[PDB]
Design an enzyme around this catalytic site. Sequence first.
Site, PDB file in Angstrom:
ATOM      1  N   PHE A 266       0.803  -1.223   0.000  1.00  0.00           N
ATOM      2  CA  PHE A 266       0.000   0.000   0.000  1.00  0.00           C
ATOM      3  C   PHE A 266       0.841   1.282   0.000  1.00  0.00           C
ATOM      4  CE2 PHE A 266      -3.137   2.850   2.239  1.00  0.00           C
ATOM      5  CZ  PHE A 266      -4.036   2.895   1.193  1.00  0.00           C
TER       6      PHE A 266
ATOM      7  N   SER B 187       3.201  -6.843   2.036  1.00  0.00           N
ATOM      8  CA  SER B 187       2.151  -6.149   2.762  1.00  0.00           C
ATOM      9  C   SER B 187       0.799  -6.385   2.104  1.00  0.00           C
ATOM     10  CB  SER B 187       2.472  -4.657   2.879  1.00  0.00           C
ATOM     11  OG  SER B 187       1.735  -4.043   3.934  1.00  0.00           O
ATOM     12  N   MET B 188       0.112  -5.325   1.669  1.00  0.00           N
ATOM     13  CA  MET B 188      -1.147  -5.507   0.921  1.00  0.00           C
ATOM     14  C   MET B 188      -0.918  -6.363  -0.322  1.00  0.00           C
ATOM     15  SD  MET B 188      -3.747  -2.280   0.865  1.00  0.00           S
ATOM     16  CE  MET B 188      -4.254  -1.458   2.380  1.00  0.00           C
TER      17      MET B 188
ATOM     18  N   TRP C  49      -0.818  -8.164   4.509  1.00  0.00           N
ATOM     19  CA  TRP C  49      -1.899  -7.412   5.122  1.00  0.00           C
ATOM     20  C   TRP C  49      -3.199  -7.722   4.372  1.00  0.00           C
ATOM     21  CZ3 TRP C  49      -5.863  -4.283   4.013  1.00  0.00           C
ATOM     22  CH2 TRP C  49      -6.384  -3.431   5.004  1.00  0.00           C
TER      23      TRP C  49
ATOM     24  N   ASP D 182       6.377  -5.985  13.536  1.00  0.00           N
ATOM     25  CA  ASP D 182       5.563  -5.325  12.527  1.00  0.00           C
ATOM     26  C   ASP D 182       4.350  -4.654  13.181  1.00  0.00           C
ATOM     27  OD1 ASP D 182       3.897  -4.609  10.380  1.00  0.00           O
ATOM     28  OD2 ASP D 182       4.700  -6.214   9.105  1.00  0.00           O
TER      29      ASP D 182
ATOM     30  N   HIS E  28       8.098  -3.729   9.720  1.00  0.00           N
ATOM     31  CA  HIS E  28       7.265  -3.968   8.549  1.00  0.00           C
ATOM     32  C   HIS E  28       8.076  -3.911   7.252  1.00  0.00           C
ATOM     33  CE1 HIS E  28       3.550  -4.310   6.327  1.00  0.00           C
ATOM     34  NE2 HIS E  28       3.784  -3.185   5.674  1.00  0.00           N
TER      35      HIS E  28
HETATM   36 CL   LIG Z   1       6.452  -1.587  11.534  1.00  0.00          CL
END
Ligand SMILES: [Cl-]
Length: 258
Positions: free
Chosen positions: A60, A130-131, A155, A176, A208
């Site tokens: 993202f 992530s996303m 995510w 994270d 993260h």
């Molecule tokens: Cl983080």
Amino acid sequence: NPYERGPDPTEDSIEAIRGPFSVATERVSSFASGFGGGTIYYPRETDEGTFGAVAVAPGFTASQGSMSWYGERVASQGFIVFTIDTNTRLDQPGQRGRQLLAALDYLVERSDRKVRERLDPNRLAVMGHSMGGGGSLEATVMRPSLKASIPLTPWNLDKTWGQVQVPTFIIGAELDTIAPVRTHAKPFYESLPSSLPKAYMELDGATHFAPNIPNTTIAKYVISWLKRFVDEDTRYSQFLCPNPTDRAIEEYRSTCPY
Ligand SMILES: [Cl-]
Ligand SMILES: [Ca+2]
């Protein structure tokens, strides 16, 4: 096994920054249909045969730059790697999954012939940060014929992935705070079927953004995962099974043996 490439691996070779194959690139324009373009990394030598491919999605508000270092590091191990941009930086995991699939379709149907002639269109994988890691999960439910899926500090709002039938390797970052392993990574992993070839690796101390920085612990097992399931290369089972116990690993879970 006719999908095998490169010499037999060792503890050191899977940690190598530069694999046995030399690497070249092809830029794909932002105007491609279905995704925001990107960069195709591929093995230059053709004398061992064709290679499987992995599409790699950013997270993202991020761009393919956050995922660049996977390109040479993985491609040099005998893979075609496609680090993509998304249509907009604000796209959700589902869209990222769709766009991961359009990126692979592009490889297969429209890419430059230097790429397409090196490609085995039936051995494809998805990977994402992530996303984009959520997208990796989403992609496998959209296309069960994918050989592997590597969600990196993933995510996603949807926490159940019981329908996934693609070998999935989830990587978490202990600290994270953007995609906490307790509400993303681990629920995702424990939700995948216990009968699915799968794995969870949690990086000790990592935040993260650990997947966006060259990380030998990430790389070595990403490469093993792709070798084992994109190439069906059981020379690399030794590194996956039983659970790796590197000092950098906070926790590891798996359904070994495969
Ligand atoms: Cl983080
Ligand atoms: Ca586009």
